[PDB]
C-alpha cells in the first residue's frame, strides 16, 4: 500500500545541509491545526516562524511524527511541539534557500 | 523569528 | 546560490525513508564519469545498478563527495567508490519508489 | 542488481 510520509526525512535532510553551509534554519508552521504547541500570541495569520539553529534551541528533536525542542520567547524558556503535518516549510534566514513541503495523504 | 536567537 | 549541492543529503534522506518503509534501496550510477571505481563489466548502456541495502553491502559510506562500500560481484567481494556526481538516482526495487537526482552546478 | 544480494 501507500508508504509513510516523506516530509520528515527531507526535513532533517535540508536541516543538516543548511548547517553545512553556515546558514540558519528557520521553520514555518501552520498553527490552525490540531496538535500544534506554541505561544499563539507570537503567531500571525495562522502561522509562525521558529528559529531552530543549534544555538537558539534546546534538546531539538526531529522525529517523524513531530518536532520537539525548547526555546525562548521574550526570554521565557518554553517547550514547543509541532505535528509534522503542520510543518509548511524550512528555509535559511540569510538567503531564503530551502524548500516548501509538498502535500501528502498521511497528513490528510 | 518568534523565539530568541540564543537559548543560552 | 553557490552553496554546496543537495544531492548527497537527499540521497541519505531517501536511503532511510526506504529502509524504513521496509524497502530495498538501489543506486543508478553513470559509469562514464571520471572517478568511478566499479566492476565495469556490469554497466549496461553506460549505467550500473547497485544494491546498497544492508545485507548486500559492507561498510557503506554514504558521504557527500562519493559513495563507498564493499559488495560481492559474481561471488568475490570488491571495493566500490562512486563520485556523488556520477549518481543518477535511488529507488526501492519492489515498487520503484524514490527519485531521479537533478543536475547541480557543483557537479558540473 | 550488479552486485549479489548478500555480502555475508
Curated annotation (Swiss-Prot), chains A, C:
Keywords: Stress response
Domain of life (superkingdom): Bacteria
Keyword Transmembrane tagged: no
Coiled coil location: none
Keyword Metal-binding attributed: no
Disulfide topology: none
GO process annotations (BP): positive regulation of protein catabolic process
GO cellular component terms given for this protein: cytosol; ribosome
Induction pattern: By amino acid starvation.
Function of the molecule: Seems to act in concert with SspA in the regulation of several proteins during exponential and stationary-phase growth. The exact function of SspB is not yet known.
Family: Belongs to the SspB family.
Protein's name according to its UniProt entry: Stringent starvation protein B
Naturally occurring in which organism (per UniProt): Escherichia coli O157:H7
Higher taxonomy: Bacteria, Pseudomonadati, Pseudomonadota, Gammaproteobacteria, Enterobacterales
Full-protein interval shown: 4 to 111 of 165
